[PDB]
Amino acid sequence: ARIRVVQGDITEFQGDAIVNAANNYLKLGAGVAGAILRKGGPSIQEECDRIGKIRVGEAAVTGAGNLPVRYVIHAAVLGDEPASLETVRKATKSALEKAVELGLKTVAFPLLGTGVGGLPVEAVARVMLEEIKKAPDTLEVTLYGYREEDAEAIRRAL
């Protein structure tokens, strides 16, 4: 895979899709998921509802409403199970698996598990980069740090 690192609002990403740090109930509540719902519109939650609960570690795909991107890949990092580097690794792999299957060429990922999940940026960046590097070169993953120091931490892990 190809990798870019930026600092900013993931909802403004211009590409094929963005990954949402989701709970397995696919409920857009706390975190940026709330901003995603806000800017994307209720259609995102509606599609999530139609899908129903999934298992922590898995991912689900829906449209992105009014977001510049086409899809929102919901990576379930916590909920019925606590966030951990293990759930982060699994959710990342699942999100990537969905991206490849849709033949996407540009997808943005946040540091899964570091928001509501409360996991450390350095450890999460490491785990996610290991999984991302296994993806095909046809896919370019943009990692978003919500603070400049987070983006800098991701770059140090490259």
How long is the chain? 158
Distance of alpha carbon 13 from alpha carbon 108, whole angstroms: 7
Distance of alpha carbon 58 from alpha carbon 67, whole angstroms: 23
Distance of alpha carbon 114 from alpha carbon 74, whole angstroms: 15
Distance of alpha carbon 103 from alpha carbon 143, whole angstroms: 19
Sign of the CA dihedral 113, 48, 28, 78?
Answer: negative
Domain count, the chain: 1
Within the chain, residue ranges assigned H as helices are: 33-40, 43-51, 85-101, 121-132, 148-157
User: Which residue's structure tokens are 């990692």?
Assistant: 143
Sign of the CA dihedral 133, 27, 43, 114?
Answer: negative
Question: Are the C-beta atoms of 17 and 142 separated by less than 8 Å?
Answer: no
Amino acid code (one letter) for 85: L
Question: Are the C-beta atoms of 31 and 24 separated by less than 8 Å?
Answer: no
Q: What is the CATH number of the domain that holds 145?
A: 3.40.220.10
Sign of the CA dihedral 36, 37, 41, 42?
Answer: positive
DSSP code at position 32: T
Tokens of 136: 């095909």
CA atoms within 13 A on the CB side of 154: 25
Domain ranges, residue 95: 1-158
Rg of the Cα trace of the chain?
14
Tokens of 17: 């899709």
Residue 143's φ and ψ, nearest 5 degrees, are -95, 130
Question: Are the C-beta atoms of 25 and 33 separated by less than 8 Å?
Answer: no
| Cα–Cα distance list, 149 to 14, 19, 61, 79 (Å) | 22, 21, 30, 27
Resolution of the entry in angstroms: 1.8
Using the CB atoms, write b or e for 108-123: b if 16+ within 10 Å.
Answer: bbbbbbbbbbebebee
Residues 93, 38, 65, 112, Cα dihedral to 10°:
-10
What is the per-residue DSSP string for 54-86?
--TT-EEEEE-TTSSSSEEEEEEEESSS---HH
Experiment used for this model: X-ray
